[model samples]
Target: RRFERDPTIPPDSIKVYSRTLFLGGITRSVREPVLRSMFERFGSVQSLILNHNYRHGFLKMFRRDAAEKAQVAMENVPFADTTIRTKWGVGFGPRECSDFSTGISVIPIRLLTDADRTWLVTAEYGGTGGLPITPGIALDEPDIEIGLGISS
Candidate 1:
């Protein structure tokens, strides 16, 4: 999988966040051990994100820095050197659901509110994009808008 590299990653630097990374490879029959081993490097699972689509989820971390570490460490890192590889990325709003990490805000303002917080879920497929977002518990909460609180 081609993870979106940290655009913030300096030509000669590294991106590190301890937040959670998303997973999106679920199917009618998803495997667990594979995820356990893939994310074992980070330790264990935190939450599971099941989108309207059944083949994706999120994998959150205690720290955003750790998530970034895993991204850079696994990106391009051969997985038994097969089609099933690893990748890392940065995104805003929400994870590209595959390869976008900008979802992270400025470190200082990150925890200002839950809106700035990144969501984490363990996905099954490592290579998926543009999955439908169903109206579930995840959507129950309102999003954040700087001065405006997420309360409706």
Candidate 2:
């Protein structure tokens, strides 16, 4: 679908209309620093969330103007060898408390601890954990044990 405004969702309720932009078509090859560097050109990036499993993420800007500019400029733009889609995130409500800048902050998958990895993997399969989605895809590969630095 093109980046046209939907009639169903109210503009004020949309995430992009405020300060957040929903990103799609992200790949594992893309890193947090790369995304932060790119978006920081427009304005201060309050927070960034990348989902390696689903290939999508959300970027929250400090100012609404910055968000608007970033959305207009980045929509359909080629990034990290792939064309990414930018759209107004729907059904995302505003935060009740201002203490937290945004949702969970970005953390590299490689830096996650073994306990964190176990919790994430289990949660992806409908177990109890912090993240119900967005578990690292590398953990599911056949050589996961080796990747985790475990000897055979």
Which candidate achieves the best TM-score against the true structure? 2
- What TM-score does prediction 1 earn? 0.38
TM-score of 2: 0.49
- The residue-by-residue lDDT of candidate 1 on 42-135, one tens digit each, is 6544443444264445555433445566556655433332322233333223432222443332222222224333221112212112232221
True-structure lDDT of candidate 1:
0.37
In candidate 1 the C-alpha lDDT for residue 57 amounts to 50
Compared with the true structure, what per-residue lDDT tens digits does model 2 show for residues 55-107? 89988775556766888887787866677766644212223311132321223
Candidate 2: worst-modelled 10 consecutive residues by lDDT: 137-146
Model 2 regions more than 4 Å off: 1-16, 90-152
Clashes of 2: 0
